[PDB]
Ligand binder design. Structure first.
Ligand SMILES: [Cl-]
Ligand SMILES: [Cl-]
Ligand SMILES: [Cl-]
Ligand SMILES: [Cl-]
Ligand SMILES: [Mn+2]
Ligand SMILES: [Mn+2]
Ligand SMILES: [Mn+2]
Ligand SMILES: [Mn+2]
Ligand SMILES: [Mn+2]
Ligand SMILES: [Mn+2]
Ligand SMILES: [Mn+2]
Ligand SMILES: [Mn+2]
Lengths: 440, 440, 440, 440
């Protein structure tokens, strides 16, 4: 599953539909990024630029011109064909091939952007520009507008109105097409296979980074070359650090390991967390905490649907957590009073859910306290956790346990679809999986 | 093998030895780098900062103060301990533990750098600063000097002399310690194992990126989490693109595949290229080009020693290449005249060798045309190649063949040591390896 | 005559009337400007900021908030009262006194602008900001918007729309109130007195700068402390340089002197040019050129009225000039053909008229080729000139003559009012004035 | 008196003498400065650039190249001749005429600076650059060094050492040549004539700015077109504000007026303060304060000589002030104890002396607490004052009196020469001068 040229075109048209007549929208590619000295990190296109193009080159700018309510057209600035640069560094789309390949009306050399952009903006009323997104983009836009402002003797005029297109575009991204959902479904499947693999490979004495290796290899084999975020493999006390990415420790017999890892497939993020015993068997204490987190996730999966909210479902999770922690003696007091005091917060200190898409922590308005009413097409994670610090004032057997369990879902007309349920999470199923692997 | 605290300390002392009395050297950590939106790329420390610290955090600055010819001391600015930031994002060394851990005299919070740096520079004659390396560093240094310049009424004075320490430090890095050579030897071994694996796994129908996956997994399993540069897997015509990193094509029965890949192990780069038949058997045409590149490499490995140069060895390679290309009818004319015309350049268009170390294309002065006389302790690659474009005006059977073969060596008292000879390169040995793998 | 608090308030209200509901307009003061080292030039307030405040301090920002269509209010950020800074550098208005003094609703310390501005913009739909006017202003505005964009978890939201208020405000400035016209009338009178003085003082052997001295002294004595632009005193060949401000030469018996000088009175510019003989008597050649320029000015003054344009009146001037130059043998050919060839341009190379107000070359849209139809309330200069270079291919007696004659006018319902006719320009009147002065 | 080409050349050579072999010094002109919109302030050349050139254009850079200990040469970058730009804006020196006019070896177009500067710096060991003086200069220098650093394949090398030339040049400026002293002597005479004029013109009912007008006119008539700093005319309570420049008040019968004003003559500053009765007669209270300030100045003028210091002479002044204030009941207690408590500071809160030269507050190292030992050739002001605030807790008759009296001196072998004693300061002489003027 992928996103095709015609869909990128529909998206451009949908933006144009929302634009004022006599306007242009400017969407800039990501800069290349230094890793060390003359070596660069593998290129990652800006998500918004990608959303409108599927074009994976730097030094590119998409310009959507809405001349009036019936007439509009698109211009791409992109790197020129150049035999020598291409022999050295890779093929470039160039100007001749871009209109057919991408479905844009015209293509111009990026080297000419300062000579040409002001001409495209001249006489327009509105420019849509994500001011502050990139310095290099701001320089180009500001220079063009300055030429126009100062060019009255050449009969030039600048658009006086600049609108940030990010709110409009991010609202677009928040609601996935069926094609996007298909891509995300595949990202979920790939990511789940990687997590299953990690559980089947994990043995005491392996390093945390070994599981990262297994996961990344599995992503790659299905054509997801890169993770969507830096893989977290937190064993023992490291599981209590939320974005632990050092992954440097030897995994101990008797500890849990928390793996938060997700692929990037055709630009879209998977995002799964599973926590499991390094030795394949939960201790009683580990199981007692695990059961609370799992009940939290299972209840959330039953509840998530159009018409509820992240805030509302979070309330149910908080009650499950406080109730369970009281039962174990980690919290003490009346459940309702403890809920009113947000007494869970030392142990569950992050959000239950974030949007998911071209970014793992995806764009889109949540509403105050994530109260926005859910609707079909929204894609989000569900990631309850409990983290009991090594020095927590709690019964000793619970100290140093960090557990999170995370699935990716899409809101549907009738509830939700779980994209990541193909990797097990019931503790008996985790144990069975690991027992079977450990016998081989 | 690794680099220890005491070696980082020796390096600091060696720099101090070269500094003027009444001076301070300022060495800044790399900034964190955005991948997309709120996600960052895995952190890569600045090589020079790493060279003097082995410290893998951002927002850190090493200050070496040489008060006079006998008295000197070190101050580290680094991120403070903070419970909440650490629960979220990972452990921090902090100020209390840094002096013992890193072997620095004093540690201060990075948040206080603007309040403290000018006080350390006050009254000194010279500041050593890599101006232009990082914007954030320049801002900090310029602000401190400005406070001093403008602070005469507070009895403050700025050092009037600013010296770029990069030439001195890069000359240090150019000559490896035995401990560095041991690390590089391990990087070579790890990298060679990965290349052997790629040859043993490669089958027609696999994608180029599948071999990247095998390689990266092998790096990881030996504790080299990241590659030292973006992996190149160029099959068929893609082999004729030097830094081809798309790795997106299905590998065809009958094509060669060129793999240029290297691990990063304790900060140090491996860097190997092997080219081999996708189907395990060189065609006659492929073998004829391969033999010339291999002879070029083998001769270079015999010749590299103290007292010669990259330029001198390159001359021998150019003769081998021109001679071989004349024999095959790719070039036509007198060998000596063709050499004088640099007639090889359409087919071998890059350098034979680069320095290797904390950066894959390592720091250090080459001399004009890479004429610098080689000495023991220098580490460099040897990477002849021939690239015959799909549309080259040559006998048709050679079109679309890209071959490079690359080893990493260290110059010794008696010649050189090859760090990467544990992955095969003789064509009969490549074929034997692949035949054996293909039977399993 | 001056501009009062109530008028500044009317202007603010007129801007608010044009703003969208749910918006704020930000108007920034001019920065102080270095002359040399620690000395600054005399402060000149930004014209737009002045237009809305009459407030002559730096580090000030006017914020007009239009909450909805009935409710609006104003906030001034300005420098705090500070005993020590004031003993040293001068009195400051401060926050307590500003609301009554300026007629703003609230005043806050400029030192708090970053802590407060984002709070004022939070939740608004539109921000009006002159992007690119001042770097320091852009930094403040961009920082506020960034805080809002990134502050969703604190329930903050940025206005997505930024509108340049300069076109609206400049259109306001283009049409003067009766009170503005009274101020400009006084500026014209002061400026005319200065020019009369220069003619009465001028003698061969005086330096060009001596006339500058007389002029500036006259401005000062009427309470116009500063000129509105750098005074031009171009004698002989220097008269052929349009913005000659060196004023360094000894004025020669037999040369003309061209003086272009204007006061700044309560923020408003006078702008007069007179050219006259250094020795009090035009030569025949000087008179012949002078007569053409004077006829050009006199005709323009008869013609300027509502319903014509600068372009239209310029056409009449071009015919007068070409006709006169043909008569003298400076141009050769058919007048209509010469007009069609713009043959006047080597000798009259600048515009006939510019707008006049808070800036000497005042703000406001001219239309293509200055074709905008004139309306009552517009204020403009009328400044024909002829400049015959020392090496021009013309009858020798005309070489090195530079003549311009410039008056300031206001368009009225019935034509125009000349604000600067109280300094003579008829050649016989110039000669009479100078003869009378030279006898004293 | 002026500074000639040969002296500018001697200065360049004196700098070169102090430079390391294999180095270049870069001295940049001041940028033009906006007053409002398209109008600029009158150009003021950077003092250091002026010191080495006497060249009054922007977009100019002096480059002094010291190839080795015997060979050196100079290159000027400056604006090209351009007929059209010159007709519009003024004559330019250009490249052809600059070598002879300025005594530099070569001149190049400023438009070519980026193409040429790196070529001049290539292979040098040291660059002398005033980092942070001007943004535009830093951009040019940083760009050149970056080209060199990155140009090893083009056999380019950057100087690794950057030295701020300001300390060396400012030490040069601190010691005046006889020719500089002659210019400063004339500046003192011009400035004194202006102050005499102000005293002779002052009448109750005139505005403070009227005296500014008289002063500026007098500067101009002697060929000092501009003041060296913004003129201060502080009458009554305004005299208690140190840099009062509003000069907006009507001068009252019975008040003092303090005038601090100085011309700029051939780049050099005069700097005189005189305080006198608006009505020509000191009141008893005014005289009592005046006498203390005058005794302070007269004693300072007797004492200033080689071998003492500003700090030492200040001690004598503090004793005079404390003694006098005790006598009048403004201070109460033991004189020595009051001195130890710095009890004078509420009334005399500024320094007695600053260096004087191309800047009014001239460059040069003062030493801690201005303790540097004075030597012949140093030029400084002597400016005791007493300022009794309107609300001071002192006998009522002294409230609102601000008095300063300031002369400019040059340290000589035998003491000092007073450059400004030609304007009176003894109270009986002030009264006589004013009485005589008031009778006319
Ligand atoms: Cl391009
Ligand atoms: Cl910190
Ligand atoms: Cl403030
Ligand atoms: Cl130029
Ligand atoms: Mn998540
Ligand atoms: Mn996650
Ligand atoms: Mn290599
Ligand atoms: Mn390589
Ligand atoms: Mn004008
Ligand atoms: Mn004018
Ligand atoms: Mn002074
Ligand atoms: Mn003074």
């Amino acid at each position: 599953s992928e996103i095709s040229r015609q869909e990128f075109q529909r998206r451009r048209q949908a933006l144009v539909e929302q634009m004022q007549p006599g306007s242009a929208a400017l969407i800039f590619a990501a800069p290349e990024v230094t890793r060390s000295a003359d070596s660069e990190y593998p290129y990652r296109q800006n998500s918004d630029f990608w959303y409108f193009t599927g074009f994976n080159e730097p030094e590119a700018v998409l310009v959507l011109i809405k001349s009036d309510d019936t007439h509009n057209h698109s211009v791409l600035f992109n790197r020129v064909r150049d035999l020598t640069a291409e022999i050295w560094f890779g093929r470039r789309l160039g100007q001749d091939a871009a209109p057919e390949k991408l479905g844009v009306d015209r293509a111009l050399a990026f080297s000419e952007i300062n000579q040409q952009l002001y001409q495209l903006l001249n006489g327009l009323d509105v420019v849509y520009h994500a001011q502050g997104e990139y310095a290099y983009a701001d320089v180009i836009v500001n220079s063009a507008l300055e030429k126009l402002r100062k060019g009255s003797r050449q009969n030039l005029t600048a658009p006086a109105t600049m609108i940030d297109w990010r709110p409009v575009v991010h609202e677009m991204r928040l609601f996935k097409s069926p094609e996007e959902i298909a891509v995300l479904r595949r990202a979920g499947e790939i990511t789940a296979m990687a997590h299953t693999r990690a559980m089947e490979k994990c043995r005491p004495g392996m390093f945390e980074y070994h599981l990262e290796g297994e996961i990344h290899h599995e992503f790659n084999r299905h054509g997801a070359r890169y993770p969507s975020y830096n893989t977290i493999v937190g064993s023992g006390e490291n599981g209590c650090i939320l974005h632990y990415t050092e992954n440097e420790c030897e995994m101990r017999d008797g500890d849990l390991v928390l793996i938060d890892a997700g692929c990037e497939y055709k630009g879209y993020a998977g995002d799964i967390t599973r926590t499991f015993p390094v030795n394949g068997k939960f201790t009683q204490a580990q199981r007692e905490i695990y059961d609370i987190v799992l009940e939290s996730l299972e209840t959330s999966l039953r509840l998530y649907r159009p018409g509820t909210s992240i805030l509302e479902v979070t309330g149910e999770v908080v009650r499950i957590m406080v109730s369970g922690l009281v039962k174990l003696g980690i919290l003490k007091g009346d459940v309702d009073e403890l809920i009113a005091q947000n007494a869970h917060r030392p142990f569950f200190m992050h959000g239950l859910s974030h949007w998911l898409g071209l970014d793992v922590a995806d764009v889109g308005v949540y509403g105050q306290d994530r109260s926005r009413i859910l609707e079909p097409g929204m894609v989000l994670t569900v990631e309850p956790g409990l983290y009991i610090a090594p020095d927590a004032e709690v019964p000793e057997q619970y100290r140093g346990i960090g557990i999170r369990i995370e699935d990716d879902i899409v809101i549907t007309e009738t509830g939700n679809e779980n994209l990541t349920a193909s990797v097990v999470k019931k503790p008996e199923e985790i144990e069975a999986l690991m027992v079977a692997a450990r016998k081989q």
